[PDB]
């Protein structure tokens, strides 16, 4: 089997957060649609798969000219991991060699140009992940973690809590929009973060993710201006 | 000397972000006032000191029946540390034994009740700090830190990045509202975080910090609701 570059868009119907959000529209196009358009315009992929439990999402995906994989209910439940859905997609189409890129519909401001630039960072030989990320508002060294019995432990050093921010290393958080991996690597590791992980840095604005009604309205604002 | 429980309220005049904010009113009472009220109603303190270079700030403090320390210009500049201000206040009143608690005017939704509950966590034998903190919107284990420009390492494990959040230890950040220490320990270490540090957890809402006019309006609307 030849290598294929695969895009997998996991888009189950249920969202406790914002109801049916994968088909909620922004500027007239569903969230699913905006992500499908990003995948297509990137020209990075041989095949674009929407994996869904089915129904109106499956129909929407077919209207965009992309493939549909039907996940059983267990793999589209509230607890089902994203990795298990991507592994299932790959097994269903029978691809185990090339690249696999997770594109979440919840990042509608992530464009095809973003995908292309992230792809530029992917090393075919080295095969570490490329993951989109954004800067952190609150520095994650300036935190403590709850441990047992009402105690806490610093993230790193107690001295970090008082350290001038700019003397700490720069921190980024993965933003959910893009995860690129080598396919055989992802299958073998059963995860999206494979070392050496590269980050594709996006602004806060382009990193907005849709969990609530207010995120939807805010993202739509950002589109228009 | 006999031990004393000291509250120190640093309230400099020349705030740059929100002009003159320490006397800006929120529902009829100055920021200074709200924190003084909280210190008095807590009943945790033997003495309450407002340290300031501002004449109007000193008057306001006197009007609430608490002590005023005059802060020299050098300890009231834009870059003067809080620790140097507390050390000076303690030196000025001649207290070097008991506890000392920093109560920033910029946390006006922090109440006497919050202060009293935090105080209950302090251990006179062990003498670690008690610091108020709030939950993190973004989990600090789900971050990566820049190690040499182009390279990033996970905060802790690669696997943390994709772990479902509810399976990670809960995380918190200092909110600036309350820092309780042993006085001799604070003087010897010249810092606010002394091991073993414990947190007093506050809501995001009660943790609101006043850095802007909009912040002040938000706090006021919160008290109104
Ligand atoms: N096993 C999974 C996990 C996530 N998703 C999808 O991937 C995106 C990211 O999901 P997220 O917003 O983190 O949480 P949800 O599971 O969407 O929403 P809810 O939690 O309210 O059900 C969404 O488009 C969601 O539908 C999916 O299809 N299948
Ligand atoms: N050395 C210090 C540091 C801080 N503060 C006070 O502590 C609170 C928190 O500090 P910050 O929010 O930074 O306020 P300002 O320094 O007053 O404002 P700006 O930073 O906008 O100049 C404020 O009541 C501030 O006046 C102080 O009196 N002396
Ligand atoms: Ca969000
Ligand atoms: Ca300041
Ligand atoms: Ca501030």
* Dihedral, B221, A224, A9, A70 alpha carbons, nearest 10: 90
| Closest in B121, B138, B169 to A173, CB measured | B138
CA distance B87 to B105: 18
Question: Chain-centre distance of CA B50, in angstroms?
Answer: 14
* Distance separating alpha carbons of residues B61 and B50, to the nearest angstrom: 7
Q: In Å, how far from its chain's centre is CA B88?
A: 17
Question: Which residues, judged by CB distance below 6 Å to any ligand atom, belong to the binding site of ligand 1?
Answer: A 10-12, 14-17, 22, 76, 78, 80, 82, 85, 104-106, 211
Q: Read off the tokens for B45.
A: 């303190």
Can you tell me which residue has the tokens 């740059």?
B16
Report how far ligand 4's centroid is from the alpha carbon of B75 (Å): 12
**Alpha carbon A198 to its chain's center:** 14
Distance from C-alpha of A25 to C-alpha of B205, rounded to nearest angstrom: 31
| Close Cβ partners of B200 (under 8 Å, ≥ 6 residues apart) | B114, B117, B118, B121, B130, B131, B132, B133, B178
Q: What's chain A's length in residues?
A: 225
A153: three-class secondary structure by DSSP? strand
Give the helix/strand (H/E) hosting A212: none
B 7-46 residues with CB below 8 A of A?
none
CB contact under 8 A, B136 and A136: no
SS3 for A96? coil
Of chain A, the end-to-end C-alpha distance in Å amounts to 46
Shortest CA distance from B134: residue in chain A: A143
Resolution number, Å: 1.8
Are B61 and B22 a contacting pair, CB within 8 Å?
A: no
Residue B79's CB: how many other CB atoms inside 10 A? 5
Give the N- to C-terminal CA distance of chain B in Å, as an integer.
46
Q: Which domain holds residue A56?
A: 1-225
Domain count, chain A: 1
CA–centroid distance, B197 to ligand 2, in Å, is 23
At residue A157, the 3 state secondary structure works out as coil
**Residues lining ligand 2, Cβ inside 6 A:** B 10-12, 15-17, 22, 78, 80-82, 85, 104-106, 211
Q: Are A197 and A131 in contact (CB under 8 A)?
A: yes
The first and second tokens of residue A37, run together, are 């358009």
Q: Which residues are registered as beta bridge partners of B134?
A: B173
| Rounded (10°) angle between helices A31-42 and A112-119 | 50
CATH for A187? 3.90.550.10
Instruction: Write out A4-66 in H/E/C secondary structure.
Output: EEEEEEECCCCCCCCCCHHHCEECCEEHHHHHHHHHHHHCCCCEEEEEECCHHHHHHHHHCCC
**Per-residue H/E/C for chain B:** CCCEEEEEEECCCCCCCCCCHHHCEECCEEHHHHHHHHHHHHCCCCEEEEEECCHHHHHHHHHCCCEEEECCHHHCCCCCCHHHHHHHHHHHHCCCCEEEEECCCCCCCCCHHHHHHHHHCCCCCCCCCEEEEEECCCCCCCCEEECCCCCEEECCCHHHHCCCHHHCCCEEEEEEEEEEEEHHHHHHHCCCCCCCCEEEECCCCCCCCCCCHHHHHHHHHHHHC
Q: Kindly state the tokens that stand for B148.
A: 């040499």
Cα A161 from Cα A1, distance rounded (Å): 53
A176 backbone dihedrals φ, ψ, rounded to 5°: 85, -10
Distance, in Å, from the CA atom of B182 to the CA atom of B199, rounded to the nearest integer, reads 15
How far is it, in rounded angstroms, from Cα A98 to Cα A118?
Answer: 16
Angle, helices B112-120/B31-42, rounded to nearest 10 degrees: 50
DSSP calls for A173-209: EEEEEEEEEEHHHHHHHTSS--SS-EEEE--TTTT--
Whether residue A121 lies within 8 A of chain B, CB to CB, comes out as no
- H/E run at residue A69: strand A67-70
Which of A10, A132, A152 should we substitute to test contact with B (largest number of B Cβ atoms within 10 Å)? A152
């Amino acid at each position: 089997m030849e290598k294929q570059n695969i895009a997998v868009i996991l888009a189950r119907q249920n969202s406790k957060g914002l109801p049916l959000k994968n088909l909620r529209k922004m500027n007239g196009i569903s969230l699913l649609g905006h992500t499908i358009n990003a995948a297509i315009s990137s020209k990075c992929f041989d095949r674009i798969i929407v994996s869904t439990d089915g129904g109106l999402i499956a129909e929407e995906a077919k209207n965009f000219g992309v493939e549909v994989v039907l996940r059983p209910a267990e793999l589209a439940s509230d607890t089902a991991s994203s990795i298990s859905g991507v592994i299932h997609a790959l097994e269903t189409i029978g691809s185990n060699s090339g690249t696999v890129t997770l594109l979440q519909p919840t990042s509608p401001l992530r464009t095809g140009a973003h995908i292309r630039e992230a792809f530029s960072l992917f090393d075919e030989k080295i095969k570490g992940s490329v993951v989109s990320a954004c800067p952190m508002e609150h520095h994650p060294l300036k935190t403590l973690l709850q441990i047992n019995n009402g105690e806490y432990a610093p993230m790193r050093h107690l001295s970090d809590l008082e350290q001038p921010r700019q003397q700490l290393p720069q921190a980024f958080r993965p933003n959910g929009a893009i995860y690129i991996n080598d396919t055989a690597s992802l299958i073998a590791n059963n995860c999206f973060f494979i070392a050496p992980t590269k980050l594709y840095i996006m602004s806060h604005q382009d990193s907005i993710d849709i969990d609530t009604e207010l995120d939807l309205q805010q993202a739509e604002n950002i589109l228009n201006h």
